[PDB]
Amino acid sequence: LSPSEIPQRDWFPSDFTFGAATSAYQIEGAWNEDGKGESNWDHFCHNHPERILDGSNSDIGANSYHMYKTDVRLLKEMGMDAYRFSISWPRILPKGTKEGGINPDGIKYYRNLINLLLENGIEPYVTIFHWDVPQALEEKYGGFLDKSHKSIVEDYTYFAKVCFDNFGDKVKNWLTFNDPQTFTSFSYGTGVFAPGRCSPGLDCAYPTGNSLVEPYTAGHNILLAHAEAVDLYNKHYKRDDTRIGLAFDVMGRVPYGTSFLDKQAEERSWDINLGWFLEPVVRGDYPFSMRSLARERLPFFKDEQKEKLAGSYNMLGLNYYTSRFSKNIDISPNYSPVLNTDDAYASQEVNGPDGKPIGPPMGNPWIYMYPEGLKDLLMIMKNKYGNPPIYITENGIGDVDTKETPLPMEAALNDYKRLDYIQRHIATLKESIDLGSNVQGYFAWSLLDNFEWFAGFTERYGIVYVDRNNNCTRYMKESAKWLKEFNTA
């Protein structure tokens, strides 16, 4: 990557935002201290260690509940403009409900972190929910599987309230949800995420759900929850200087072949991945393609739910990592969807028709570098969805570090493959910005190496190394080095 091709901070406006992000369950630890209630993930890891690649859990994680001061320190040192982190629902509301009571320690922790960030001039981008549903709600009504579409909605809205109430004065950027598609699809479709539900006959801890129905039920409840929280937010906490939205996980889609069929398959793929949650918050309802394909398996919104959903955001987060080639699949008696994602009638290929991958492999089993994909996504957001304020809330790669193939600390700190990847994506935002894209910021995903869900600790996504052998000592990597130089020059 040419020396002049390498991004410079002056390439972006002075009001542009650069930061890093994390998620509560992945870094906090102290899973059962100071009154924090049990979460779906606490439950899943403890009860199904066999469902985690290396059978680990996040009881400690990056131990950020105790070491948050150092996290804010690395942020300051790197010269980061902002920090995106999430709030653990069960740590704020142990039972997840109002009557359950608010846990003062949870409030204290987040209150302290936020103040520390401000103190050092780092803007806090708070994600209210990042997959950590209080187990209490999970057993009471299955959480977001809530068939009534009322319970999980009200409890989330209240949770949202407790956050707005205790942090509204200090937090100017809110994100109700993060990666809603990954959450519903992996937790109820493939079953790789807590609680591990999937259609009978599939390989997951609880093969007694419905991969073709539950993800949509969960998704429906997430959208209702989001709408309700934004409604509450806009009415009592919103200030001219504050904003609220949600972040979507999305893989770019490129027509497998030159047939117009694959172009249609590609469109169905954007719809089922990004459109699923984006269109509802934009126009108030699911993509036409999804409704025509999922059918009754995709709930309908009430007229009053659509009004609330439509325009329920001031900004949008995009978590981009890789792209895929979408290959057409014809509707036929020979084909029956099994997973919610099959409803798109398109296979997502890593390799194009020439046998070469859409982009160079970044290390783990799924990330393939293709910054052009981010460009296409931003063009869609710009030309099709109103060109709203966009923040790349996640972007990065995971360095594999297994028991069988340990990543030497030396090799872990020399993360040049990560640096190249980051510099390239940042350059893409520059190209997109010149093209009229409304991108306002970029958050390197994973400030710290941490628990990676079903992958456990087999992957290091941080720009900051965490030596869990030595009390989780943090060491900046080369990528973090460059970011510092980038922000401080």
Ligand X SMILES: COc1ccc2c(c1)O[C@@H](O)C(=O)N2O
Q: Which residues contact its own copies (rule: CB under 8 A)?
A: 260-261, 264, 283, 285, 288-289, 291-293, 300, 328, 330-333, 345, 384-385
Q: Indicate the helix (H) or strand (E) that contains 174.
A: strand 173-178
Tell me how far, at minimum, the Cβ of 282 lies from its own copies, in Å.
10
Q: Which of 130, 243 has the CB closer to ligand X?
A: 130
Using the contact rule CB under 6 A, the part of the chain among 3-11, 108-116, 118-126, 449-457 near ligand X is: 449-457
SS3 176: strand
What x/- string results for residues 181 through 220 when contact with ligand X is judged by CB under 6 A? -x--------------------------------------
Residues 239-258 that bind ligand X (CB under 6 A): 249
Nearest to 134 by CA among 87, 75, 82: 87
Q: Which of 122, 455 has the CB closer to ligand X?
A: 455
Q: Which of 66, 297 has the CB closer to its own copies?
A: 297
Tell me how far, at minimum, the Cβ of 309 lies from its own copies, in Å.
13
256 close to 326: Cβ distance less than 8 angstroms = yes
Q: Which of 5, 296 has the CB closer to its own copies?
A: 296
Nearest to 437 by CA among 371, 382, 380: 382
Instruction: Give yes or no for a cis peptide into 195 (omega within 30° of 0).
Output: yes
- Residue 261, contacted partner among ligand X, its own copies, none, CB below 5-8 A by kind: its own copies
Strand partners, 123: 82
DSSP category for residue 209: S
Q: Which of 182, 305 has the CB closer to ligand X?
A: 182
Q: Is 342 in the site for ligand X (CB under 6 A)?
A: no
Q: Which of 52, 92 has the CB closer to ligand X?
A: 52
- Residue 291, contacted partner among ligand X, its own copies, none, CB below 5-8 A by kind: its own copies
Which are the contacts of 286, defined by CB distance < 8 A and separation ≥ 6? 275, 276, 279, 280, 298
Tell me how far, at minimum, the Cβ of 267 lies from its own copies, in Å.
9
- Residue 260, contacted partner among ligand X, its own copies, none, CB below 5-8 A by kind: its own copies
Tell me how far, at minimum, the Cβ of 219 lies from its own copies, in Å.
17
Tell me how far, at minimum, the Cβ of 453 lies from ligand X, in Å.
4
| Interatomic CA distance for residues 82 and 301, integer angstroms | 35
- Residue 242, contacted partner among ligand X, its own copies, none, CB below 5-8 A by kind: none
Interface with ligand X (CB under 6 A), residue from 48, 452, 465, 472:
452
- Residue 264, contacted partner among ligand X, its own copies, none, CB below 5-8 A by kind: its own copies
How many Å is the Cα radius of gyration of the chain?
A: 21
Tell me how far, at minimum, the Cβ of 454 lies from ligand X, in Å.
5
Interface with ligand X (CB under 6 A), residue from 204, 455, 463, 464:
455
Q: Which of 104, 365 has the CB closer to ligand X?
A: 365
List the beta strands (DSSP E) in 350-484.
390-394, 399-400, 439-445, 459-460, 464-467, 473-476
- Residue 182, contacted partner among its own copies, ligand X, none, CB below 5-8 A by kind: ligand X
| Interatomic CA distance for residues 72 and 248, integer angstroms | 25
Strand partners, 316: 246, 390
DSSP category for residue 189: I
Map tokens 């783990």 to a residue.
Answer: 364
- Residue 321, contacted partner among ligand X, its own copies, none, CB below 5-8 A by kind: ligand X
| Interatomic CA distance for residues 194 and 351, integer angstroms | 30
- Residue 433, contacted partner among its own copies, ligand X, none, CB below 5-8 A by kind: none
Q: Indicate the helix (H) or strand (E) that contains 69.
A: helix 64-78
SS3 423: helix
DSSP string, 219-273: HHHHHHHHHHHHHHHHHHT--TT-EEEEEEEEEEEEESSSSHHHHHHHHHHHIII
314 close to 244: Cβ distance less than 8 angstroms = yes
Residues that bind ligand X (CB under 6 A): 179, 182, 249, 321, 366, 452-455
